[PDB]
Amino acid sequence: AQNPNCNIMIFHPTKEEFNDFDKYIAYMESQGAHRAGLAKIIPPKEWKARETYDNISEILIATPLQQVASGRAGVFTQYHKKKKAMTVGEYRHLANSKKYQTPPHQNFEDLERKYWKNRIYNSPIYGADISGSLFDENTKQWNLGHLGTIQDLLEKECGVVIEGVNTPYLYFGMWKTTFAWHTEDMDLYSINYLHLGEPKTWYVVPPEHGQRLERLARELFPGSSRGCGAFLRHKVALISPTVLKENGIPFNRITQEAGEFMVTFPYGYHAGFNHGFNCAEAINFATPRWIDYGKMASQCSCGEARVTFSMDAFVRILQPERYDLWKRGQD
Ligand SMILES: Cc1ccc(C(N)=O)cn1
Ligand SMILES: O=C(O)CNC(=O)C(=O)O
Ligand code: NI
Ligand SMILES: [Zn+2]
Numbered sequence: 001a002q003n004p005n006c007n008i009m010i011f012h013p014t015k016e017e018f019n020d021f022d023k024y025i026a027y028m029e030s031q032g033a034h035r036a037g038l039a040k041i042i043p044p045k046e047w048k049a050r051e052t053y054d055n056i057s058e059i060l061i062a063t064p065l066q067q068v069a070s071g072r073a074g075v076f077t078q079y080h081k082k083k084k085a086m087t088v089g090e091y092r093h094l095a096n097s098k099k100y101q102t103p104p105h106q107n108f109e110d111l112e113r114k115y116w117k118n119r120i121y122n123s124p125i126y127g128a129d130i131s132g133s134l135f136d137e138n139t140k141q142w143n144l145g146h147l148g149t150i151q152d153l154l155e156k157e158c159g160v161v162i163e164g165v166n167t168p169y170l171y172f173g174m175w176k177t178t179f180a181w182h183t184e185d186m187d188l189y190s191i192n193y194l195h196l197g198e199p200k201t202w203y204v205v206p207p208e209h210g211q212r213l214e215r216l217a218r219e220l221f222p223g224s225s226r227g228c229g230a231f232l233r234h235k236v237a238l239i240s241p242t243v244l245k246e247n248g249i250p251f252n253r254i255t256q257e258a259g260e261f262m263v264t265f266p267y268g269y270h271a272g273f274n275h276g277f278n279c280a281e282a283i284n285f286a287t288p289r290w291i292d293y294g295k296m297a298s299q300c301s302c303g304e305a306r307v308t309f310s311m312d313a314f315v316r317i318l319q320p321e322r323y324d325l326w327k328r329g330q331d
Contacts, residue, residue, distance in 0.1 A: 002030070002032025003031065003032025003033065003035045003036065004032075004035070006035040006036045006037070006208070006209075006252070007036055007252065008036045008038050008039065008040065008204065008253075008254045009032070009036060009039050009040070010039070011024075011028060011033070011039065011040065011041045011042065012042050012044075013041065013042075013043070014044055015044040015046045015047065015141075017044075018043065018044050018047060018141045018142060019141060021141075021142060021147065022148070022287070024041075025263070026287070028041075028263070029289065033265070034207070034265040034268075034289075035206055035208065036204060036206060036252060036265075037204040037205060037206050037207050037252075037264060037265050037267075037270065038202060038263070038264050038265070038268055038270060039262070039263045039265070040256065040260055040261070040262055041260070041262075041263065042259075042261075043141075043142065043259065043261065047139075047141060047142070048136075048139065049135050049136065049143075049195060050134060050135060050136040050139065050195075051136060053134070053196050053279075056088055056196075056279065057087055057088050057089030057092065058087065058089070059088040059130070059132070059170070060085060060086075061085060061091055061172060062085050062130075063083070064084075064085070064086055064091065064125045064126070064127050065080040065082060065083070065125065065126045065127075065128055066080070066082075066123050066125050067079075067080060067123055067124055067126055067176075067177060067178055068080075068081055068123045069119060069120040069238075070120075071120065073116060073118075073240070074116065074243040075220050075238070075239055075240070075243055076119075076120050076237075076238050077180075077224075077236045077237055077238070078236055078238065079236065080126075081123075088127070088279075091127055091174075091277075092172075092277050094125065094174070095173075095174035095175070100124060100125070100174050100175060101175060102175040102198065102275060102276040103175075108199070108201070108275075111275060115176060115201075115273050116240045116241070116242065119176050119238075119273070122176055124174050124175060124178070125174060125177070126171070126172070126177040126178075127171065127172030128169075128172075129169050129171070130170040130171070130172070131167055131168075131169060131170075132168065132169070132170045133170070133281060134170065134195050134279070134281055135193075135281070142193075144168045144191060144282070144283045145167070145168050145283075147166075147283065147285055148285070149165065149166040150164075150166050150188065150284065150286045150310070150314075151163075151164050151165070151166065151310070151313070153285075153286040153287070153288075153290075154286070154314075157291055158291070158317070160317050162313035162317060163309075163310075163313055164309060164310030164311075164312070164313050164314075165310060166283065166285075166310060167283070168281050168282065169281070169282055169283065170279065170280070170281055171279065171281070171282065172277075172278070172279050173197075173200070173274030173276075173277070173279075173280070174276065174277050174278075175274065175275065175276050175277075176273060176274070177273065177274045178238065178271075178272070178273045178274075179235070179270075179272050179273070180235045180237050180238055181213065181232055181238065181239060181269055181270070181271040182232055182235045182269065182270065182271070183210070183232075183264075183266075183267050183268065183269055183270075183297075184266075184284050185284060185308065185311050185314075186293075186294045186297045186311060186314045186315075187267045187290070187294060187296070187297040188266065188284040188285065188286055188290060188293075189263060189264060189265055189266060189284065189285050189286065189287065189290060190263070190264045190282055190283065190284050190285070191261060191264075191282065191283060191285060192256070192262045192264075192280055192281070192282040193261050193280060193282070194256050194257065194258050194259065194260055194262075194279075194280045195258065195279045195280060195281060196258050196278060196279050197277045197278030197279055198258075198274065198275040198276030198277060199255045199258075199274075199275040199276075199278070200256045200273070200274050200275070200280065201254070201255045201256075201272050201273055201275070202254050202256060202270055202272040203241060203244075203251055203253050203270060203271045203272055204251060204252055204253075204254075204264070204269065204270045205249065205250060205251045205269040206250055206251075206252075206268070207265060207266060207267040207268050209249070209250045210268070210269050212248075212250070213239075213244075213251075213269050214232065216239065216247050217231075217232055217239070220237075221237055224237070227302055228301070228302035228304060229298070230298040230299055230300045230301075230305075231300070231302075231304070232269075233299070233304075233305040234304045234305055235305075238271060239271075241253065255275075258278070266289070266290050266293035267293055291318075294314060295318045295319065297318075297319075299315065299319070299326050300329065301322075301326055301328070301329040303329040303330075307329075312327065312330070315327075
């Protein structure tokens with residue numbers, strides 16, 4: 001078996017290898033990449049996402065989210081307090097202000113130490129889940145707005161015909177902005193391109209060990225667990241690498257820099273944080289190997305987790321028994 005220790009693999013496709021997205025994902029998996037839950041892909045040197053990022057400042061963040069933490073440094077939840085709209089120009093200025101800017105640090109490891117030591121004592125503002133794309137329309141390779149849709153994958157594999165669409169989202173981050181432990185909706189893949197700015201550090205649990213993380217989460221957040229059998233779907237829980245190590249949870253970490261892609265694989269739990277002002281673009285996608293994961297995916301039915309329009313059809317077709325109770329939570 002390839003990659004039995006479930007290490008995060010890093011790929012360097014040539015421009016020739018970068019033409020066929022599906023084929024390269026399949027290649028990565030032939031090398032065992034999916035066992036880690038996360039892979040890095042460094043684009044060929046000839047490739048560019050867009051010519052320049054001039055005027056990005058005009059983009060509106062309609063609902064910036066202030067990420068307020070509760071708990072202890074290594075085990076906490078965050079809730080999102082909605083703030084007034086601001087442009088990316090205003091957001092960038094805020095990110096770079098004395099109150100919010102990245103502190104002096106020696107290297108990535110020093111900054112990681114500072115993050116887990118001090119995260120809960122601050123409330124950074126995240127510009128998350130903004131529908132849109134920053135890829136040039138003339139970028140033909142790995143353009144996250146030009147991928148085959150999940151609906152077409154389901155149609156090709158299963159012959160089913162469903163409503164729904166599948167578009168990218170933009171994420172504007174600053175120092176300490178955080179994504180909580182989660183898998184994707186319906187345990188889909190995700191792909192994430194860091195367009196510009198400071199790095200993003202990722203933590204990931206191998207899919208074959210995801211239930212170990214769930215078990216620990218139920219122990220660490222017992223009230224949340226009683227409220228919902230799938231509460232990690234709420235995307236509010238953080239657990240530090242130190243606490244994961246103390247509890248024997250297998251995981252890996254890696255830092256993504258501007259110009260790099262990350263792919264998360266079905267049922268690969270991940271969490272992380274931003275180093276400073278940056279902009280990422282991400283979208284969910286599917287492959288034939290995903291279908292079985294979609295069938296098995298656990299759902300939030302307490303009503304907390306956000307349900308996109310398109311997820312309805314996935315649950316309806318892949319999980320018809322769950323559908324009625326699940327939509328009872330959506331509506
Ligand atoms: C605590 C918890 C959260 C989410 C899930 C899941 N399978 O989605 C399971 N257990
Ligand atoms: O970049 C972020 O803030 C969160 N991204 C993801 O969880 C992802 O790409 O799957
Ligand atoms: Ni994700
Ligand atoms: Zn729930």
